Protein backbone atom coordinates (compact mmCIF):
# COMPACT_ATOMS: atom_id res chain seq x y z
CA UNK A 1 0.00 0.00 0.00
CA UNK A 2 1.30 3.44 -0.90
CA UNK A 3 -0.15 6.79 0.19
CA UNK A 4 -2.46 5.21 2.74
CA UNK A 5 -2.51 5.29 6.53
CA UNK A 6 -2.28 3.09 9.59
CA UNK A 7 -5.25 0.87 10.13
CA UNK A 8 -6.82 0.81 13.58
CA UNK A 9 -6.57 -2.39 15.53
CA UNK A 10 -9.24 -4.86 14.44
CA UNK A 11 -10.23 -2.62 11.54
CA UNK A 12 -9.83 -5.43 8.97
CA UNK A 13 -10.23 -8.68 10.94
CA UNK A 14 -10.62 -10.67 7.73
CA UNK A 15 -7.12 -9.65 6.63
CA UNK A 16 -4.81 -12.59 5.89
CA UNK A 17 -1.11 -12.60 4.95
CA UNK A 18 0.02 -15.36 2.62
CA UNK A 19 3.60 -16.40 3.33
CA UNK A 20 6.07 -18.65 1.59
CA UNK A 21 6.91 -21.17 4.38
CA UNK A 22 10.65 -21.28 3.72
CA UNK A 23 12.41 -19.24 2.95
CA UNK A 24 10.07 -16.91 4.80
CA UNK A 25 8.47 -14.44 2.37
CA UNK A 26 5.28 -12.35 2.44
CA UNK A 27 3.86 -13.28 -0.96
CA UNK A 28 0.43 -11.70 -1.06
CA UNK A 29 -2.64 -10.60 0.87
CA UNK A 30 -5.76 -12.77 1.22
CA UNK A 31 -9.03 -12.67 3.15
CA UNK A 32 -10.91 -14.88 5.60
CA UNK A 33 -14.39 -15.82 4.33
CA UNK A 34 -15.24 -18.57 6.86
CA UNK A 35 -13.43 -20.49 9.61
CA UNK A 36 -11.77 -22.77 7.05
CA UNK A 37 -11.59 -20.81 3.76
CA UNK A 38 -9.28 -18.05 2.64
CA UNK A 39 -9.74 -16.13 -0.63
CA UNK A 40 -6.77 -14.80 -2.65
CA UNK A 41 -5.58 -14.17 -6.22
CA UNK A 42 -4.60 -17.08 -8.45
CA UNK A 43 -1.39 -15.38 -9.64
CA UNK A 44 -0.09 -15.41 -6.04
CA UNK A 45 -0.10 -19.21 -6.29
CA UNK A 46 0.34 -19.97 -9.97
CA UNK A 47 2.26 -18.10 -12.60
CA UNK A 48 4.10 -20.36 -15.08
CA UNK A 49 6.22 -17.63 -16.72
CA UNK A 50 8.16 -17.30 -13.46
CA UNK A 51 8.03 -20.98 -12.62
CA UNK A 52 5.59 -20.21 -9.77
CA UNK A 53 3.42 -23.16 -8.78
CA UNK A 54 3.00 -23.54 -5.01
CA UNK A 55 1.53 -26.61 -3.32
CA UNK A 56 -0.32 -26.70 0.00
CA UNK A 57 2.87 -27.52 1.90
CA UNK A 58 4.82 -24.53 0.55
CA UNK A 59 2.76 -21.96 2.45
CA UNK A 60 1.34 -20.63 5.69
CA UNK A 61 -1.23 -17.91 6.28
CA UNK A 62 -1.11 -15.47 9.16
CA UNK A 63 -4.48 -14.33 10.42
CA UNK A 64 -5.29 -11.47 12.82
CA UNK A 65 -2.15 -9.42 12.27
CA UNK A 66 -1.51 -5.73 12.79
CA UNK A 67 2.30 -5.72 12.92
CA UNK A 68 4.30 -6.35 9.74
CA UNK A 69 7.19 -8.14 11.47
CA UNK A 70 6.48 -8.91 15.10
CA UNK A 71 4.87 -12.20 16.17
CA UNK A 72 1.63 -11.14 17.86
CA UNK A 73 1.33 -13.76 20.53
CA UNK A 74 -2.22 -14.66 21.60
CA UNK A 75 -3.64 -12.47 18.80
CA UNK A 76 -2.48 -13.92 15.47
CA UNK A 77 -3.11 -17.43 14.25
CA UNK A 78 -0.77 -19.14 11.78
CA UNK A 79 -2.46 -21.84 9.70
CA UNK A 80 -1.33 -24.59 7.32
CA UNK A 81 -3.23 -25.30 4.12
CA UNK A 82 -5.20 -28.47 3.38
CA UNK A 83 -5.79 -27.73 -0.32
CA UNK A 84 -5.43 -24.97 -2.95
CA UNK A 85 -8.11 -24.39 -5.64
CA UNK A 86 -7.33 -22.19 -8.64
CA UNK A 87 -10.09 -21.02 -10.95
CA UNK A 88 -10.10 -23.44 -13.95
CA UNK A 89 -10.25 -20.54 -16.45
CA UNK A 90 -7.69 -18.32 -14.74
CA UNK A 91 -5.98 -16.68 -17.76
CA UNK A 92 -2.33 -15.90 -16.94
CA UNK A 93 -1.16 -15.67 -20.56
CA UNK A 94 -3.12 -12.60 -21.50
CA UNK A 95 -4.49 -10.44 -18.68
CA UNK A 96 -4.99 -12.30 -15.41
CA UNK A 97 -8.67 -12.84 -16.16
CA UNK A 98 -10.39 -14.80 -13.36
CA UNK A 99 -7.52 -14.09 -10.97
CA UNK A 100 -8.98 -15.94 -8.01
CA UNK A 101 -8.09 -18.90 -5.81
CA UNK A 102 -9.38 -20.55 -2.65
CA UNK A 103 -7.26 -22.04 0.14
CA UNK A 104 -8.78 -24.46 2.62
CA UNK A 105 -7.08 -24.39 6.01
CA UNK A 106 -5.96 -27.68 7.58
CA UNK A 107 -7.90 -26.74 10.70
CA UNK A 108 -10.63 -24.20 11.41
CA UNK A 109 -9.49 -20.93 12.95
CA UNK A 110 -11.38 -19.59 15.98
CA UNK A 111 -12.77 -16.08 15.59
CA UNK A 112 -11.78 -13.28 17.97
CA UNK A 113 -11.80 -9.49 18.10
CA UNK A 114 -8.99 -9.67 15.54
CA UNK A 115 -10.14 -12.58 13.40
CA UNK A 116 -13.53 -12.42 11.75
CA UNK A 117 -14.85 -13.25 8.26
CA UNK A 118 -15.89 -10.68 5.68
CA UNK A 119 -19.13 -11.25 3.75
CA UNK A 120 -19.18 -12.19 0.06
CA UNK A 121 -21.59 -10.14 -2.10
CA UNK A 122 -24.86 -11.44 -3.54
CA UNK A 123 -26.43 -9.97 -6.74
CA UNK A 124 -28.20 -7.18 -4.88
CA UNK A 125 -25.05 -6.00 -3.11
CA UNK A 126 -22.97 -6.22 -6.28
CA UNK A 127 -25.47 -4.12 -8.24
CA UNK A 128 -25.93 -1.53 -5.51
CA UNK A 129 -22.28 -1.06 -4.50
CA UNK A 130 -20.12 -1.73 -7.53
CA UNK A 131 -20.63 1.63 -9.20
CA UNK A 132 -18.15 4.22 -10.41
CA UNK A 133 -17.60 7.01 -7.89
CA UNK A 134 -18.44 4.86 -4.87
CA UNK A 135 -15.40 4.15 -2.70
CA UNK A 136 -14.14 0.81 -1.45
CA UNK A 137 -11.24 0.02 0.83
CA UNK A 138 -7.99 -1.81 0.24
CA UNK A 139 -5.59 -3.04 2.89
CA UNK A 140 -2.07 -4.32 2.94
CA UNK A 141 1.46 -3.56 4.01
CA UNK A 142 4.01 -0.81 3.35
CA UNK A 143 5.40 -1.36 10.38
CA UNK A 144 1.62 -1.67 10.72
CA UNK A 145 -1.35 -2.67 8.47
CA UNK A 146 -2.08 0.05 5.94
CA UNK A 147 -5.44 1.12 4.60
CA UNK A 148 -6.57 3.26 1.77
CA UNK A 149 -10.08 4.11 0.55
CA UNK A 150 -10.35 4.35 -3.26
CA UNK A 151 -13.13 5.10 -5.74
CA UNK A 152 -14.33 2.63 -8.37
CA UNK A 153 -13.58 4.03 -11.84
CA UNK A 154 -15.89 4.05 -14.89
CA UNK A 155 -15.24 1.02 -17.11
CA UNK A 156 -14.44 3.16 -20.21
CA UNK A 157 -11.84 5.11 -18.24
CA UNK A 158 -10.39 1.84 -16.91
CA UNK A 159 -10.18 0.41 -20.43
CA UNK A 160 -8.65 3.59 -21.89
CA UNK A 161 -5.94 3.66 -19.24
CA UNK A 162 -4.16 0.51 -20.32
CA UNK A 163 -3.18 -1.47 -23.42
CA UNK A 164 -4.28 -4.66 -21.62
CA UNK A 165 -7.71 -6.04 -22.56
CA UNK A 166 -10.06 -5.73 -19.60
CA UNK A 167 -12.73 -8.36 -19.05
CA UNK A 168 -16.09 -8.40 -17.27
CA UNK A 169 -14.32 -10.30 -14.52
CA UNK A 170 -12.31 -7.21 -13.46
CA UNK A 171 -12.95 -3.63 -12.37
CA UNK A 172 -10.57 -0.86 -11.56
CA UNK A 173 -10.33 1.69 -8.75
CA UNK A 174 -8.14 4.59 -7.77
CA UNK A 175 -8.18 8.37 -7.92
CA UNK A 176 -8.01 10.19 -11.25
CA UNK A 177 -5.37 12.91 -11.78
CA UNK A 178 -7.94 15.68 -11.16
CA UNK A 179 -9.19 14.26 -7.86
CA UNK A 180 -6.48 15.63 -5.59
CA UNK A 181 -5.99 12.42 -3.62
CA UNK A 182 -3.71 9.41 -4.09
CA UNK A 183 -3.32 5.90 -2.81
CA UNK A 184 -3.08 2.44 -4.27
CA UNK A 185 -2.56 -1.24 -3.55
CA UNK A 186 0.74 -2.49 -5.01
CA UNK A 187 1.96 -5.79 -6.46
CA UNK A 188 2.83 -6.92 -2.93
CA UNK A 189 -0.78 -6.38 -1.90
CA UNK A 190 -2.08 -8.71 -4.65
CA UNK A 191 -4.61 -11.20 -3.41
CA UNK A 192 -5.85 -8.86 -0.69
CA UNK A 193 -9.45 -7.65 -0.34
CA UNK A 194 -11.17 -4.57 -1.76
CA UNK A 195 -14.11 -4.16 0.63
CA UNK A 196 -17.18 -1.93 0.81
CA UNK A 197 -19.56 -1.16 3.70
CA UNK A 198 -23.23 -1.54 2.84
CA UNK A 199 -25.20 1.57 3.83
CA UNK A 200 -28.21 -0.77 4.10
CA UNK A 201 -27.20 -3.46 6.63
CA UNK A 202 -23.91 -1.99 7.88
CA UNK A 203 -21.92 -5.06 6.84
CA UNK A 204 -18.61 -5.19 5.01
CA UNK A 205 -18.53 -7.05 1.71
CA UNK A 206 -15.49 -8.11 -0.27
CA UNK A 207 -16.17 -6.84 -3.77
CA UNK A 208 -12.70 -7.27 -5.20
CA UNK A 209 -9.34 -8.99 -4.93
CA UNK A 210 -6.23 -6.92 -5.71
CA UNK A 211 -5.11 -8.43 -9.02
CA UNK A 212 -2.75 -6.22 -11.06
CA UNK A 213 -1.61 -2.73 -12.03
CA UNK A 214 1.08 -1.12 -14.13
CA UNK A 215 3.13 0.58 -11.43
CA UNK A 216 1.73 1.48 -8.02
CA UNK A 217 -0.13 4.76 -7.51
CA UNK A 218 0.59 6.31 -10.88
CA UNK A 219 -1.20 9.28 -12.35
CA UNK A 220 -3.74 8.18 -14.94
CA UNK A 221 -3.29 4.46 -14.18
CA UNK A 222 -5.54 2.35 -11.98
CA UNK A 223 -5.37 -0.75 -9.90
CA UNK A 224 -7.34 -3.70 -11.29
CA UNK A 225 -9.39 -6.07 -9.15
CA UNK A 226 -10.98 -9.48 -9.63
CA UNK A 227 -14.76 -8.94 -9.64
CA UNK A 228 -15.62 -11.25 -6.72
CA UNK A 229 -19.34 -11.45 -7.33
CA UNK A 230 -18.86 -12.39 -11.01
CA UNK A 231 -17.03 -15.45 -9.67
CA UNK A 232 -19.18 -16.21 -6.62
CA UNK A 233 -20.73 -19.25 -8.35
CA UNK A 234 -17.30 -20.86 -8.66
CA UNK A 235 -16.50 -20.01 -4.99
CA UNK A 236 -19.77 -21.62 -3.80
CA UNK A 237 -19.16 -24.66 -6.01
CA UNK A 238 -15.72 -25.25 -4.48
CA UNK A 239 -16.83 -24.68 -0.88
CA UNK A 240 -19.90 -26.90 -1.33
CA UNK A 241 -17.99 -29.74 -2.95
CA UNK A 242 -14.87 -29.06 -0.85
Amino acid sequence: IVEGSDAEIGMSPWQVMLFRKSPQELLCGASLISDRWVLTAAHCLLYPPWDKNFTENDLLVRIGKHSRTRYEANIEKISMLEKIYIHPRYNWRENLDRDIALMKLKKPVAFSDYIHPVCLPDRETAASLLQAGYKGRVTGWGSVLQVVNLPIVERPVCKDSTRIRITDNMFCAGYKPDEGKRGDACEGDSGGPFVMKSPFNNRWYQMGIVSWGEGCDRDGKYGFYTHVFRLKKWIQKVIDQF
Partner: peptide, 30 residues
Amino acid sequence: ADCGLRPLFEKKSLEDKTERELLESYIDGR
Protein backbone atom coordinates in the same frame (compact mmCIF):
# COMPACT_ATOMS: atom_id res chain seq x y z
CA ALA B 1 -24.28 -15.05 9.40
CA ASP B 2 -22.24 -12.69 11.53
CA CYS B 3 -19.99 -12.00 8.50
CA GLY B 4 -18.81 -8.44 7.86
CA LEU B 5 -19.63 -7.09 11.35
CA ARG B 6 -16.39 -6.33 13.19
CA PRO B 7 -16.13 -7.12 16.94
CA LEU B 8 -14.31 -3.88 17.70
CA PHE B 9 -16.45 -1.68 15.53
CA GLU B 10 -19.95 -2.58 14.30
CA LYS B 11 -20.48 -4.89 17.31
CA LYS B 12 -19.60 -2.07 19.72
CA SER B 13 -21.31 0.68 17.72
CA LEU B 14 -17.95 2.34 17.08
CA GLU B 15 -16.92 3.66 13.67
CA ASP B 16 -13.36 3.48 12.40
CA LYS B 17 -11.59 6.68 11.33
CA THR B 18 -12.39 6.66 7.64
CA GLU B 19 -15.53 4.64 7.03
CA ARG B 20 -17.49 7.87 6.99
CA GLU B 21 -15.69 8.68 3.74
CA LEU B 22 -17.04 5.43 2.17
CA LEU B 23 -20.62 6.16 3.25
CA GLU B 24 -20.33 9.69 1.95
CA SER B 25 -19.28 8.43 -1.47
CA TYR B 26 -22.75 6.86 -1.80
CA ILE B 27 -24.18 10.38 -1.60
CA ASP B 28 -21.39 12.38 -3.28
CA GLY B 29 -19.65 10.00 -5.67
CA ARG B 30 -22.52 9.39 -8.08
